[PDB]
Amino acid sequence: VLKKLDEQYQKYKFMELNLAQKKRRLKGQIPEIKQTLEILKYMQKKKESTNSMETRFLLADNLYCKASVPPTDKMCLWLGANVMLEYDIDEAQALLEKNLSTATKNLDSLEEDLDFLRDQFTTTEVNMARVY
Amino acid sequence: GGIIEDSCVLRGVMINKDVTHPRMRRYIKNPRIVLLDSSLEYKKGESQTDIEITREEDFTRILQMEEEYIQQLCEDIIQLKPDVVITEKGISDLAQHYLMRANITAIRRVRKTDNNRIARACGARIVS
Amino acid sequence: VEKYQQLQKDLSKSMSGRQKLEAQLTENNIVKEELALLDGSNVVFKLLGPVLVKQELGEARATVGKRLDYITAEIKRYESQLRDLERQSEQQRETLAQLQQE
Amino acid sequence: DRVKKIIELKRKVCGDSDKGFVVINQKGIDPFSLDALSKEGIVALRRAKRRNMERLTLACGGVALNSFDDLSPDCLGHAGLVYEYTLGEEKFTFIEKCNNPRSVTLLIKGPNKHTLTQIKDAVRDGLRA
Amino acid sequence: AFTELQAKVIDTQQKVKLADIQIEQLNRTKKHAHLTDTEIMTLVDETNMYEGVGRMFILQSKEAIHSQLLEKQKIAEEKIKELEQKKSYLERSVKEAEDNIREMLMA
Amino acid sequence: SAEQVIAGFNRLRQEQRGLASKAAELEMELNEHSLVIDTLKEVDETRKCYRMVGGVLVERTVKEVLPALENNKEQIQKIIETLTQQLQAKGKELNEFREKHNI
Amino acid sequence: APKTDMDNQIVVSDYAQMDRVLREERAYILNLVKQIKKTGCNVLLIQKSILRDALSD
Amino acid sequence: NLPQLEMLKNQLDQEVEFLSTSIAQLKVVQTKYVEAKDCLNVLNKSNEGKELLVPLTSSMYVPGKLHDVEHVLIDVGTGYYVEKTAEDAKDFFKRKIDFLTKQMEKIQPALQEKHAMKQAVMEMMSQ
Amino acid sequence: DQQKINKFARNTSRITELKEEIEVKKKQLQNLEDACDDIMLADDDCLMIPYQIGDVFISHSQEETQEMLEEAKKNLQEEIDALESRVESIQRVLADLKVQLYAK
């Protein structure tokens, strides 16, 4: 009968929107951790890339000041919530690679399981309807 | 309210159409009525029409000249000593409340046919 | 009828990249205000991807002048694209609506 | 919250169980509250008609709240005698000898037909004559 | 006619809603510029102190940074006067004119 | 009358949405206080810790960064319970004033 | 260029992708124009641009 | 009359919010133009040589030394390098501030036009 | 109730997700490739060639400037071959799920 088919159409469509709220937050994490690795792994340090280089600093989004670089060998990374610690290259490298590998797999392993959690919600609401 | 029989005709032209409230005074024996179709639009610049007050920077400079146009008009009106001024054309919110500071309760939101009757209530010419 | 939305989506997709050009169109006029003040006071480079390549001021004036011209070339085709897709679909709104009725 | 407010009001108005206290609620009341209010010396009538809500305020008294805060007998009205009468599938509580006997209720019986409607406007025109 | 003078004071109401929200920002910017001045007046250990507007943070001694941060709360202190005088002025403009509108339409 | 009851329940529901924006706004920050205090204790703290937020770096040590981390996490979980109780008490207050007015 | 929806078939949201492909459109029309004058031409008959897809000015 | 106006007042509500969101976007664009001038005010005044922590990338800061405060990059055009001095850079920022204000100024009575027309439909349904 | 059409619904959706991943990696491939050719054509090694790594810069030869982009094109293209090796594997089950509706 098409009447049983029509009730499962609407219950499948409404549960798609609850999945997209969770995937986009998983989506928003990925490019931010992606920028951390590729910029570090190409420059690798003032130390590791063989002294004084060039720079045009980021003062703002459109205002870059050209200067000569030479700093001392540290990187003060930003953790968040009133926290800055000074770091080095070896501490900053292996941490973000782990956050790089998971953020893909956080997007990949959930997006299948969200597709079946939708299928749990559409299947549950129709069997109670046909009985009582 | 009231009843027909203990009423009588009164002089001038009596108004019931918009003014139903004591916005003029409570009572007046001597002071005159003022009908204003004259230009009461204030000066934004020195004698110029710039933008109006929407900024703090526009607040400090312009407002000194906003009341300055009004107080010149108010000094012209106090020459005949009113206590009531009604204003119809060119009426501003600041203009009718510096008159509150000039001890004259000021009136707007009246249709033109009222103020033809009010001009015939006193037999005077509405100043331009 | 899918033919109603299809001509609209092909029109609206072209408009979105066209509205991208107009902010670029204004800023192409902004840089020509700034290149006119330079005569050797400050040289210019070119920001192209991960490489920042040296330019000259006459090289800069032709560069933003070309990109000003490529925007105007894509403006005029959309005016053809606007009137064609709105007139073809208007003919379709009468005929394809009668297909679903009978 | 609304169960505990009934207890403070009974001691505020009456002070004892010898003097009664009647709650006419326009809505239904919890039966576990109707058990606990019955022991305190309170009868609590429920699902009252909205037409009765104004007329009881006129003759007897009693104003509407959404709380049961501590109120004096000046804020409430009075009735001299309350009796729960039963005829039919519903109980019909009689409330007579008001704070002010200003409205007199004409209670007709009938088979709940248009005959009950026919005796309704007949006594209505009986009163208007 | 009388329809036009209705819409003028209604358009004046939304200008007050713009005037009401500007004072909430400028009160916050004064106290927050005061709050950051307290945390740098808290420490006595280090004269090292970084200031910036973007994501740049220049190395300067803290004492010159205090007096600049004394000026940061002060300009935000200066603006809450001129806005609240303005916000009251736009409030007095619409509300006193609103007394003219309803009582003479209902008349 | 039954209109003062059914409309007053609509008034309490709109304050549940007025309750909704403020408590969850703080609630997103305490999980950020969760992830920060754990990474600091695992990493080396002998070198000096700073506090970097948008627009200011004050040169600090680990002993001054650490207590405010545990402080600002505990202040949030108190207010999100506090903002719940106040707005739900407000829904109880407007209902009884509507019943005492139009009677 | 060929045309299905757009005369300049880009999905354009970027300045580099509109620069790299459209300078190359200038490239081949540089070489065809030079072949006209070298063979000797002074008056040229051009039909409508609706009789074609586009004519590059 | 009334069923047409109930459909009409709901359409203008989106048209206010679609324009007002575009106002909210362009304020962010002029926000960094105010922000870039105020970074530049500290630059000429302090000196060359002072240490800065700039973003190497997102949430990662690299130290460095400051030199040549009187020559800055301005990012205009379609994303093009324009080297200017710091003095002409302040003029072009405030020019872009008034420009983004001008972009919102053409929307602003039309933003109020969609609001006042919707209120008039609320009055015409009421009248 | 059929579990083979449960496999058939999963199979066609896996066809769709693979082809979209190929298209976005092809456009990134040409983007880096055409970024190589434009910067070589203008101004080779005269005094120095600055190259962007974030906001700091390195000055070296013109061909090494391509070389960082050349490596990412090599990594991206090997994925495209491996993506199409999964596009081929999702087609063999599609020919076999038709018989399994009749078998079980």
Swiss-Prot record, chain A:
Q: Does the keyword Chaperone apply?
A: yes
Tell me which UniProt keywords the record has, alphabetically.
Acetylation, Chaperone, Cytoplasm, Nucleus
N6-acetyllysine PTM sites in chain numbering: 11
Where is the protein situated, by its record's location annotation? Cytoplasm; Nucleus
- The superkingdom of the source organism is Eukaryota
Major place of residence? cytoplasm
Q: Name one GO molecular function term.
A: unfolded protein binding
A GO CC annotation given for this chain: nucleus
Tissue specificity of this protein: Ubiquitous.
Residue stretches spanning the membrane:
none
- What family is it from? Belongs to the prefoldin subunit alpha family.
Q: Summarize the protein's role.
A: Binds specifically to cytosolic chaperonin (c-CPN) and transfers target proteins to it. Binds to nascent polypeptide chain and promotes folding in an environment in which there are many competing pathways for nonnative proteins.
Indicate what this protein is called per its UniProt record. Prefoldin subunit 3
The species this protein belongs to is Homo sapiens (Human)
The organism that produces this protein has a lineage beginning with: Eukaryota, Metazoa, Chordata, Craniata, Vertebrata
From Swiss-Prot, chain F:
* Cell location: Nucleus; Cytoplasm; Mitochondrion
Provide a GO biological process annotation.
protein folding
Recite the UniProt keywords alphabetically.
Answer: Chaperone, Cytoplasm, Mitochondrion, Nucleus
This entry's Gene Ontology molecular function terms read: amyloid-beta binding; protein folding chaperone; unfolded protein binding
Of the GO CC terms on this record, one is: mitochondrion
Coarsely, its chief localization is nucleus
* Signal peptide from the UniProt entry: none
What is this protein's function per UniProt?
Binds specifically to cytosolic chaperonin (c-CPN) and transfers target proteins to it. Binds to nascent polypeptide chain and promotes folding in an environment in which there are many competing pathways for nonnative proteins.
- Which family is annotated? Belongs to the prefoldin subunit beta family.
Query: Could you give the subunit structure recorded for this chain?
Result: Heterohexamer of two PFD-alpha type and four PFD-beta type subunits. Component of the PAQosome complex which is responsible for the biogenesis of several protein complexes and which consists of R2TP complex members RUVBL1, RUVBL2, RPAP3 and PIH1D1, URI complex members PFDN2, PFDN6, PDRG1, UXT and URI1 as well as ASDURF, POLR2E and DNAAF10/WDR92. Interacts with URI1; the interaction is phosphorylation-dependent and occurs in a growth-dependent manner.
Know the name of this protein?
Answer: Prefoldin subunit 2
Q: Which organism is it from?
A: Homo sapiens
First and last residue shown, out of the full length, are 22 to 124 of 154
Curated annotation (Swiss-Prot), chain G:
Positions modified as N6-acetyllysine? 34, 48
Location in the cell = Cytoplasm; Melanosome; Cytoplasm, Cytoskeleton, Microtubule organizing center, Centrosome; Cytoplasm, Cytoskeleton, Cilium basal body
Task: Fill in the subunit field for this protein.
Answer: Component of the chaperonin-containing T-complex (TRiC), a hexadecamer composed of two identical back-to-back stacked rings enclosing a protein folding chamber. Each ring is made up of eight different subunits: TCP1/CCT1, CCT2, CCT3, CCT4, CCT5, CCT6A/CCT6, CCT7, CCT8. Interacts with PACRG. Interacts with DNAAF4. Interacts with DLEC1.
Q: Which organism is it from?
A: Homo sapiens (Human)
- Give the protein's function: Component of the chaperonin-containing T-complex (TRiC), a molecular chaperone complex that assists the folding of actin, tubulin and other proteins upon ATP hydrolysis. The TRiC complex mediates the folding of WRAP53/TCAB1, thereby regulating telomere maintenance. As part of the TRiC complex may play a role in the assembly of BBSome, a complex involved in ciliogenesis regulating transports vesicles to the cilia.
Protein family per UniProt? Belongs to the TCP-1 chaperonin family.
Name of the gene this protein is made from: CCT4
Q: This protein is called what?
A: T-complex protein 1 subunit delta
Curated annotation (Swiss-Prot), chain H:
Q: Which residues carry this modification: Phosphoserine?
A: 46
Q: What keywords appear on the UniProt entry?
A: Acetylation, Chaperone, Cytoplasm, Nucleus, Phosphoprotein
Q: Which domain of life is it from?
A: Eukaryota
Show the GO cellular component annotation of the record. cytoplasm; cytosol; intermediate filament cytoskeleton; nucleus; prefoldin complex
Q: Which residues carry this modification: N6-acetyllysine?
A: 32
**Any single biological process term in GO:** chaperone-mediated protein folding
Q: Which GO terms describe its molecular function?
A: amyloid-beta binding; transcription corepressor activity; unfolded protein binding
Q: In which tissues is it expressed?
A: Highly expressed in pancreas and skeletal muscle and moderately in other tissues.
Q: Does the keyword Nucleus apply?
A: yes
Its biological purpose is as follows:
Binds specifically to cytosolic chaperonin (c-CPN) and transfers target proteins to it. Binds to nascent polypeptide chain and promotes folding in an environment in which there are many competing pathways for nonnative proteins. Represses the transcriptional activity of MYC.
The record's subunit annotation is: Heterohexamer of two PFD-alpha type and four PFD-beta type subunits. Binds to MYC; interacts with its N-terminal domain.
Give the family this protein belongs to, as stated in its UniProt record: Belongs to the prefoldin subunit alpha family.
**The protein's name:** Prefoldin subunit 5
Species for this entry: Homo sapiens (Human)
* Location of this fragment in the whole protein: 11 to 137 of 154
